[PDB]
């Protein structure tokens, strides 16, 4: 399986100098996008979620409604 991936990676054309920079920027943008997606704990209607945390156990003073409320990934 890894051999196929290596062959595919090698087969990519060696585009101009700016092609690599553009690809790096696109990869960074996609990483930020997925971080954003999984950094918002997808709670559903009417529910809530305070931060069940792994840093500082679980906080008590911070209170969250349902909706725009960010998780830290897997945390």
């Amino acid at each position: 399986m890894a051999q196929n991936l290596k062959d595919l990676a090698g087969r990519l054309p060696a585009g101009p100098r700016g092609m690599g920079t553009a690809l790096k920027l696109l990869l960074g943008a996609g990483a930020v996008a997925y971080g954003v997606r999984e950094s918002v704990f997808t709670v559903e209607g009417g529910h809530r979620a305070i931060f069940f945390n792994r840093i500082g156990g679980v906080q008590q003073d911070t209170i969250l409604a349902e909706g725009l409320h960010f998780r830290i990934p897997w945390f």
Partner: protein
Amino acid sequence: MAAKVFESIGKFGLALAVAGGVVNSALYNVDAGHRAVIFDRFRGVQDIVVGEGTHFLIPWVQKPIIFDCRSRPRNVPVITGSKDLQNVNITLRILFRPVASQLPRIFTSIGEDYDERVLPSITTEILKSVVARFDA
């Protein structure tokens, strides 16, 4: 020139089809006496009832909850003890309807199906209490 025109026409047709599909996916029929609600995820469920009208939404976040703000009966049988403590098997008939205004709370609190959990509950409680109080 003809080939470019045909290609542009095809691209415009595909774009129009995609837009029409997106618009269609954003609407749900509202049969008169149906007052839906928005069940999103970036807010959960909103605070504003959808009237008996076609009101818009965005995709994959709302699953069209076509409620029904019409009336409905129910029969509750209760094996109640009376004052003289009989086995009064009382089947009460109850008519009820919801309210258009605050349906989104109704959906958040319980969900799409609401009446079954409560009707036997309160009806049996009150039948038992009242008949218990009253002779057979």
